[PDB]
Each structure stands twice: as structure tokens, then as C-alpha cells.
């Protein structure tokens, strides 16, 4: 049972196959056109369904070339509303029809955001993207809204003709518009079943530049090189993915780079990953966020969680493949090193939720609760530390990854829950079934808070990183002189960073520490987004005045929501700068992405 959804179930009729024509208009901010599902029943005498909508003007519904009945249910919040449509004749189990919808987006359509031509690099056109997942989708169009159904799909959109309209899925070619020739027609097919959250649509001034012999990078024109330089290790990342998961099977992965209120660090749309340009730190250090996309490509893609209760699934698999890519990449040191500053994340959530908070437990009843709001790290920490205590618990990383393979091929294109996932753990490790009870499942998987059990850790490019943080804290004002520019000489970017996580999960330090670290460390010239990110909530809850603007223009100028979010709040709380947050928001909300514009306002308590 989805609770997110109230579309009919996968029990009663799935989706096989969406044929969406539509025409993107800037003018209007809508998507106007056609959602033909083919709809295959799983019943006898089934005689209506249920599809989700969300702000959608349904025009008509089609069946057998003849206009059918149709009703929207009320509005159930975060959820939109529910389609029920009258089927004309009553289907037998397993009989297909095809049902074609009309349709229009509202432009406040949550999947959405339209950018004017000042909010892109270019300024001269405007911009359209969207981000589907989790249940935004039924904000695109009417659908089963639900990864607990798979289907291909095939589309043609009709944009302005100087625009550029790319999809999640292969591209099958451009011609005019037959009814309006200021406008190109762009094709797609995608020939492998895939949950309607991958789903996926950019439409703007995009250049292509090619970085490997299945990439191609896409952006606007200005940051195209700087991208494909950013992204160059795709093709070597994608065969290490290989490697360890089995046959890549999208045909091409090619990256988008969008502009930088993208809401999210990437988003592994299949055959084209969206990322922040927030990546793009001009040393390829935060390449991970590429190794995590490529990695769903078979943990997520392939093998779909079959509710959001169960996302852990999807993303602790996709970050413990991440990790493996990263340590295959620099060194088993390294992918240690990766593992033990996710630790810390989990510990920075579990201590802001709180460690009774439900949403800190790895599975999940999402019930009345918006995914948006429940979203954090703890699915994604939680869920990979669990695989890296059973991957030590089983006998090491290559034991573990010829069951991460095998995981993959039996569930190649389903939709999976937690038990069957334990099932197969348990069927794979039968001659370990001993070790296998003695883990605490009911804790790890359905307890709130810490794991029971913390994994170890190879400690070795961490201790650099938590002594200089313990000098720091230690220090008194008789020792601020003895910290010096050369302190980081042997630090790589990746341990300034976790320099800086360490300090700030002590936060605040006296505001003289930090003006000295300001002074040797010059730390505001340093322009990687996550260590920026950082020291600046280092500095704003250490209440430093002067990094109030800095703090301001981060928080605005892109839309990251790793990075807008903390910002924000940490702005909000200190009392010189809250005034200048809620205004800043104020300001900024009408322009800012609906699900951004709609966190960061809870989070601010305004509205
Ligand atoms: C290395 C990763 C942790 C990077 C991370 N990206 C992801 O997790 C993507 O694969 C997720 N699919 C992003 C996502 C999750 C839920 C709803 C909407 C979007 C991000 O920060 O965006
Ligand atoms: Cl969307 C989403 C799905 C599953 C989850 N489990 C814990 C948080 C969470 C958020
Ligand atoms: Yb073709
Ligand atoms: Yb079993
Ligand atoms: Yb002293
Ligand atoms: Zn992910």
C-alpha cells in the first residue's frame, strides 16, 4: 500500500507505457498536452481507476476515441487530488486500454520552476526544469504516482525553436513544429520501465559539449567548459559502476548542469543526471555527487523502493556504491575516510531531529507526512552504515559486493520493500544465518536514534582533521598566535572540509577564535561551495557580524537545499541578522523554487 499516493494500486491496474505530447509555453508558465497511459487491468471487471493529480486542469478523457467521465476528488494537501475516471467498458484481468488525458500544469506547479531570462546565465531566454521525485510528478501530469509501478515512455514536446528541450530517456531526434513554425518538436523513448518519479524535463539555452564515449555534459553556454573539465572522471566512474553492479543498460549517461536553484546536489534522472552547478569547484573534488548518480543507475533506477517507507533502500545501497566508486578511485583509505564523515552527518540529523524522533528511524510510516518534510540524511547515513557494519560482519568488502551484485540482478526492474530485501540478505548469507541473528534488526531498521552499533573506521586521513578542530576548541586567547596559514599545508580539500565539520558540530567558539581564522586560514576566499557552506554557519553561529552578508548572498544566489536551508535558519536564530533573513526570504520566495520556497519558509516560521 502507497500512502503517498491516491492513485489506484498496482493490485488492481498498472501503468505499462506513458506517450506525453505537450507544448512548454513561457508566456502562461504551463505544459499543456496529452498523457496517453496504456493501462494494463490487474482485475476482472474493473471498471473505473484512480490516477494522482496535483493543480492540474483536466481539458477531457479519451477512450476509444470517445469524451468519458472523470471527477477530481478534494484536494488532500501535499498529495493534490485524485482522478477517478470511468472506464466505458469493463476490462478483464490483464486486458490493456489506452487512455488519453488533456491536460494543462498550473505555473505553480511544485514539480516545476520557470526561470526568466535574468535568473539564467545567458539572459536572454528563459529557462524551464523539473524535479519529479518524490511525488511530484502528478504536479506534471495525471499518473500512478508511485514507484511501486514500473513503465516506458515516449514523448514529444514542442518548444520555442531557439530553446532546447532534454528528457530522462534517449534522444530521438528534432524537427519543426508542422502547426506553428516558431517552434521545434524535440522526440524521446524510453525503452526501459522505470517508476514515473525518474520521469524528467529541462527546456532552455542548452550547449552539449562530449567528455566521454556515453556523456555528454549539457549546459548553458557559460559553463560548458568549466563542466566537462569538473565532470571529466564520468566514463571511468561509470566503468567501476559497471564492475561492481552489473550492465549499464540506459545507453547514454549524459549530465545536465542546472542553473543554481536546483534544488538538490544531483538528481539520477535516467540517461541524464541533473546537478548543482554548486559542483563545479574547479578541482573536480566533489565528484562523489557523480559516483552517488551513476550508482542509481542500478540501486534505485533498477531496484525501485516500492513505497517511500522504504527509500532506505535506494539510497544507503546508492551511497555505499558511491563509496566503493571513491575508494576503487583513491584508495580504500579514502572510501574509510568518506564513511566516517557520513557518520558525522548522521549524528548532525539524529541531534536536530532529536534521538526519539521518528523520522530517525531507517524504515519509516509516512502516513499524512510530506516526504519533503521528512527528508534528510538519516535514510542515507543510517541506511549506509548498516551495510558497511554487515559488510564487516560478513567478511569483508568483496564478500559484500558479490551480494550487492546479486541483489541487483534478481531485482532488476521491480519494485522491492525492506523484507525483501532481509529475505535475500538471508538467502545469499544462509551459511552465515548465525552471524545474520545476532544483528539487531528490530533496532537498526525500525528504532529511532543512533544504530546500535557503530562500524570501524580506518582513522588514518581523519586524525589530521579531528587534532587541528581539538586545537582549535582548546585553544584560549594565549594561544591564537600559535596558528599559522601553514597548519593546512598538507590538507586536501576534502579535509578542510572536515576540518570545518568537526569545529562546527562544537559551535559555537568565541568569536576571537574565529576572527582568527579568518586571519591565517583566509577561509573566505576559498570558493568550494561545501566548505564555504561550513564556515559560514561556523562564523554566523559564532555570531560574527561581518559574515551576515556573506551568509546572505550564499543562501540567495543559489538554491542548493543542503546549503540554503541551515543558512537561512542560522540567520534566522541570531539576533542581529533575523530581521534581514525573513525579509531576504520575503523578497527572494516568489522566484525561489515551490518546494525550496515552501521548506525554507517552515523553517522560518513565516506565512
Ligand atoms: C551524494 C548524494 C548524497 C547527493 C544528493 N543527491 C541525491 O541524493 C539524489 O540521488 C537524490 N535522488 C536526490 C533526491 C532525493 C529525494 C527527493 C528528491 C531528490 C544531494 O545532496 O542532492
Ligand atoms: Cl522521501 C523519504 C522517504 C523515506 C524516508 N525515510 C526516512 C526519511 C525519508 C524520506
Ligand atoms: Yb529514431
Ligand atoms: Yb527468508
Ligand atoms: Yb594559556
Ligand atoms: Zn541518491
Not at 158 to 171: H, T
Request: hydrophobic share 35%; glycine share 4%.
Amino acid at each position: 500500500v502507497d500512502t503517498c499516493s491516491l492513485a489506484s494500486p498496482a493490485s488492481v491496474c498498472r501503468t505499462k507505457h506513458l506517450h506525453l505530447r505537450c507544448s512548454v509555453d513561457f508566456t502562461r508558465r504551463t505544459l499543456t498536452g496529452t498523457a496517453a497511459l496504456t493501462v494494463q487491468s490487474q482485475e476482472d471487471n474493473l471498471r473505473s481507476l484512480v490516477l494522482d493529480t496535483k493543480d492540474l486542469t483536466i481539458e477531457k478523457v479519451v477512450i476509444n476515441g470517445q469524451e468519458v467521465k472523470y471527477a477530481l476528488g478534494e484536494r488532500q494537501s501535499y498529495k493534490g487530488s485524485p482522478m477517478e475516471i470511468s472506464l466505458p467498458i469493463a476490462l478483464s484481468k490483464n486486458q490493456e486500454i489506452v487512455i488519453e488525458i488533456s491536460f494543462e500544469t498550473s505555473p505553480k506547479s511544485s514539480a516545476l520552476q520557470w526561470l526568466t531570462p535574468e535568473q539564467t546565465s545567458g539572459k536572454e531566454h528563459p529557462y524551464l526544469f523539473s524535479q519529479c521525485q518524490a511525488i511530484h510528478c502528478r504536479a506534471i501530469l495525471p499518473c500512478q504516482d508511485t514507484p511501486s509501478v514500473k513503465l516506458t515512455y515516449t514523448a514529444e514536446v514542442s518548444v520555442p525553436k531557439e530553446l532546447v528541450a532534454l528528457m530522462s530517456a534517449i534522444r530521438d531526434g528534432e524537427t519543426p513544429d508542422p502547426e506553428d513554425p516558431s517552434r521545434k518538436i524535440y522526440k524521446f523513448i524510453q525503452k526501459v520501465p522505470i517508476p514515473c518519479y525518474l520521469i524528467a524535463l529541462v527546456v532552455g539555452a542548452l550547449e552539449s559539449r562530449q567528455i566521454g564515449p556515453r556523456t555528454l555534459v549539457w549546459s548553458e553556454k557559460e559553463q560548458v567548459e568549466k563542466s566537462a573539465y569538473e565532470f571529466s572522471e564520468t566514463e571511468s566512474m561509470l566503468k567501476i559502476a559497471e564492475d561492481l553492479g552489473g550492465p549499464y543498460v540506459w545507453g547514454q549517461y549524459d549530465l545536465l548542469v542546472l542553473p543554481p536553484s536546483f534544488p538538490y546536489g544531483g538528481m539520477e534522472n535516467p540517461c541524464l543526471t541533473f546537478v548543482t552547478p554548486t559542483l563545479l569547484a574547479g578541482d573536480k573534488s566533489l565528484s562523489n555527487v557523480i559516483a552517488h548518480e551513476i550508482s542509481h543507475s542500478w540501486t534505485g533506477n533498477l531496484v525501485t523502493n516500492k513505497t517511500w517507507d522504504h527509500f532506505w533502500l535506494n539510497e544507503g545501497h546508492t551511497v555505499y556504491l558511491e563509496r566503493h566508486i571513491c575508494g576503487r578511485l583513491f584508495g580504500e583509505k579514502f572510501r574509510h575516510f568518506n564513511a566516517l564523515g557520513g557518520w558525522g552527518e548522521l549524528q548532525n540529523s539524529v541531534k536536530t531531529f532529536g534521538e526519539t524522533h521518528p523520522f530517525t528511524k531507517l524504515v519509516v510510516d509516512l502516513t499524512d507526512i510530506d516526504p519533503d518534510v521528512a527528508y534528510s540524511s538519516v535514510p542515507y547515513e543510517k541506511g549506509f552504515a548498516l551495510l558497511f557494519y554487515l559488510e564487516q560482519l560478513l567478511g569483508g568488502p568483496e564478500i559484500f559486493l558479490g551480494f550487492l551484485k546479486a541483489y541487483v540482478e534478481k531485482f532488476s526492474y521491480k519494485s522491492i520493500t525492506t523484507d525483501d530485501w532481509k529475505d535475500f540478505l538471508y538467502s545469499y548469507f544462509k551459511d552465515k544465518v548465525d552471524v545474520l541473528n545476532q544483528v539487531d534488526w528490530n533496532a537498526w531498521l525500525y528504532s529511532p536514534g543512533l544504530p546500535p552499533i557503530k562500524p570501524n573506521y580506518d582513522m588514518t586521513l581523519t586524525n589530521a582533521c579531528i587534532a587541528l578542530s581539538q586545537r582549535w576548541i582548546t585553544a584560549k586567547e594565549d594561544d591564537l598566535n600559535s596558528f599559522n596559514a601553514t597548519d593546512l599545508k598538507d590538507l586536501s580539500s576534502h579535509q578542510l572540509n572536515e576540518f570545518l565539520a568537526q569545529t562546527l558540530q562544537r559551535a559555537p567558539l568565541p568569536l576571537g577564535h574565529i576572527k582568527r581564522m579568518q586571519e591565517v586560514y583566509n577561509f573566505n576566499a576559498i570558493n568550494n561551495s561545501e566548505i564555504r557552506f561550513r564556515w559560514l554557519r561556523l562564523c554566523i553561529q559564532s555570531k560574527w557580524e561581518d559574515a551576515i552578508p556573506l551568509a546572505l548572498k550564499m543562501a540567495t544566489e543559489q538554491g542548493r537545499m543542503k546549503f540554503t536551508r541551515p543558512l537561512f535558519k542560522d540567520l534566522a536564530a541570531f539576533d542581529k541578522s533575523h530581521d534581514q533573513a525573513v525579509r531576504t526570504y520575503q523578497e527572494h520566495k516568489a522566484s525561489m523554487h515551490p518546494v525550496t520556497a515552501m521548506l525554507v519558509g517552515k523553517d522560518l516560521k513565516v506565512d
